[PDB]
Amino acid sequence: MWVYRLKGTLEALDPILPGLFDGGARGLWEREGEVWAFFPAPVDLPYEGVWEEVGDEW
């Protein structure tokens, strides 16, 4: 899985969240000042978030 990491809370980033799902996000997880958006693979987005690959399994 890939994660797109964006600085901000779910509240703060609310306006762009539907666009993340439209782009293929499977779910969002708010973690210490960031929103992690999970994608099967990177996709074209304008936000300059950080792409990072994650394993299923901490």
Partner: protein, 72 residues
């Protein structure tokens, strides 16, 4: 009472949760039953249609969990 080990703040598509990330790792790292949450969230939200649902999962030291959703 019970003792909390984690709180997990997600947004998930209504009715469409699976054990895949973010759910699997977010809950699984604390031993919460992934499939039970998936089924419970999907029951709580499937009839909401195409919505994105804020959900907060509290996980306890005995690996049980509770959750709260917001509409919609």
């Amino acid at each position: 009472m019970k003792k909390v080990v984690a709180v997990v703040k997600l947004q998930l598509p209504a009715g469409k949760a699976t054990p895949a990330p973010p759910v699997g790792p977010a809950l699984g790292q604390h031993g919460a039953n992934i499939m039970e949450f998936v089924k419970a969230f999907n029951a709580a939200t499937a009839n909401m249609g195409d919505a994105i649902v804020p959900v907060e999962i509290t996980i306890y030291a005995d690996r049980s969990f509770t959750f709260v959703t917001k509409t919609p």
